[PDB]
Every structure is written in structure tokens, then in C-alpha cells.
């Protein structure tokens, strides 16, 4: 009904395969090297997805590029959670068709806590009866949920943009605004996870030569350049709730 909703649905990415060799035995390096590749693949789709976003061309270029490189973990995690929820009703983590984590893979990835945290998110989509329309909208907002504390180049267009996106999630909601609490609460809960995942990948990066884990070129840049800014507290998510 909104143009807005129309758009989000129009531009929502398709399936992205990891390229994983499900014939070889589960193993940290095989698994994590496939996840990293999928990250990269998923990121090209996030850039294209983001550029076709309402208002997105508004922002300064460096602002566009920054916001993307700060928020990519969160978005990917969110939609991975939806993917899992809609395809395997949250029983397993559906990273891509060729990369589904069962508990064994959860443990082999050495990321178990985090995966369980992600499997929970997924279940929330269920327990809260999240609509495809709420999902799109929430995901949209997640691109505008992490900023450096020194603010952006055009902090004003950003704020405008972020304010409108909230107004839209509100519109597709509109006792009832308890739904808002819930959705904002769920949204807030993505960050802790993304942060946990950020430390994890960053270390993985540091020691990657010595565990034969393969980082794609652009992924190593981002993780070495933009991610530490987050981890050092220079870049912060915006929570709805203190």
C-alpha cells in the first residue's frame, strides 16, 4: 500500500548460495571460509539493496559507504534469522541453501553461543508472529541503526531518513503499540549479537593464517578497518531502549 512497502518488497534480494562443499566433513576452516565467502556475496547484495532504498541517495557518499560497512553484520544476521524461520521453522540456522548449520555445525564453527543467540532471534520471529512487512521495515531500519559517535558528514539527512523509516514501521503497525515495544525490543536485540560476531570475526581474522580460514579481500579490509572502529567504541548502535 505504501509506495514504501512496495519498494522494500521490490528490492528485497534473492537467494545467495555460499558455495560450500557439503561433501567434505564439517571443520572450522571449511565452514568459516564458506561463511566468509557468503558474507562477501551477501554484501554485494546489501550494497545494491541499499542504493535502491527510499531516501538512501540523500546521504553523502561517505555516509552511505560508512553506514553500510557498520551495519552489514546486523542486517545479514536479521535476514538470516528470517530465512531460518521461514524455511526450517528455526530448528537450524539457514545461512544459505548450501550452508545450513545444525547443532553439530554450530559446535564445529566454534561459534556456538552466538549461533544459539541467533537461533533465538529466529524463534522470536515465530513467537512474536512477525509479518513479512514488519520484517522488511525492521531490516530497512537496521541500516540506519549504527553511527560513529562523532556523527556523520550529513548527520541531519541521516536523522531525517532514520526518523521516516521509524514512521513507516509505525505505519504498517498502525495494547497494539505494545507491538512497537516488542519490535523495537527485538531490533535492539540484534546488536549484542552483531557485536559478539564482530569480535569473533576480527580475532578469526587476526589468526587466520594460523587456522587456514579464508578471508575474501574486501572482507578483510572491512573487518580490519571499519569493524575495529565499532569494537573500540568509536562507532555505536542506536538502541531504542537504554
Amino acid at each position: 500500500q505504501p509506495i514504501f512497502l512496495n519498494v522494500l518488497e521490490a528490492i528485497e534480494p534473492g537467494v545467495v548460495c555460499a558455495g560450500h562443499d557439503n561433501n567434505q566433513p564439517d571443520s572450522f576452516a571449511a565452514l568459516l571460509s564458506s561463511l566468509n565467502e557468503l558474507g562477501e556475496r551477501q554484501l554485494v547484495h546489501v550494497v545494491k539493496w541499499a542504493k535502491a532504498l527510499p531516501g538512501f541517495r540523500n546521504l553523502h557518499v561517505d555516509d552511505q559507504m560508512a553506514v553500510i560497512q557498520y551495519s552489514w553484520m546486523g542486517l545479514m544476521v536479521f535476514a538470516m534469522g528470517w530465512r531460518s524461520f521461514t524455511n526450517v521453522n528455526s530448528a537450524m540456522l539457514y545461512f544459505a541453501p548450501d550452508l545450513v548449520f545444525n547443532e553439530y555445525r554450530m559446535h564445529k564453527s566454534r561459534m556456538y553461543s552466538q549461533c544459539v543467540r541467533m537461533r533465538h532471534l529466529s524463534q522470536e520471529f515465530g513467537w512474536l508472529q512477525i509479518t513479512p512487512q514488519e520484517f522488511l521495515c525492521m531490516k530497512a531500519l537496521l541500516l540506519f541503526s549504527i553511527i560513529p559517535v562523532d556523527g556523520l558528514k550529513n548527520q541531519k539527512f541521516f536523522d531525517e531518513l532514520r526518523m521516516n523509516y521509524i514512521k513507516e514501521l509505525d505505519r504498517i503497525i498502525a495494547s497494539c503499540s505494545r507491538r512497537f515495544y516488542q519490535l523495537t525490543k527485538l531490533l535492539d536485540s540484534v546488536q549484542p549479537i552483531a557485536r559478539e560476531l564482530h569480535q569473533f570475526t576480527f580475532d578469526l581474522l587476526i589468526k587466520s593464517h594460523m587456522v587456514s580460514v579464508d578471508f575474501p579481500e574486501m572482507m578483510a579490509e572491512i573487518i580490519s578497518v571499519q569493524v575495529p572502529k565499532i569494537l573500540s567504541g568509536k562507532v555505536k548502535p542506536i538502541y531504542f531502549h537504554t
Binding site: 552511505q64 559507504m65 578497518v225
Partner: peptide
């Protein structure tokens, strides 16, 4: 930056 050349 690879990301930046890519983005543009």
C-alpha cells in the same frame, strides 16, 4: 579502499 572503489 577495495570497498570504496567497489561502491563507486
Amino acid at each position: 579502499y577495495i570497498f570504496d572503489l567497489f561502491y563507486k
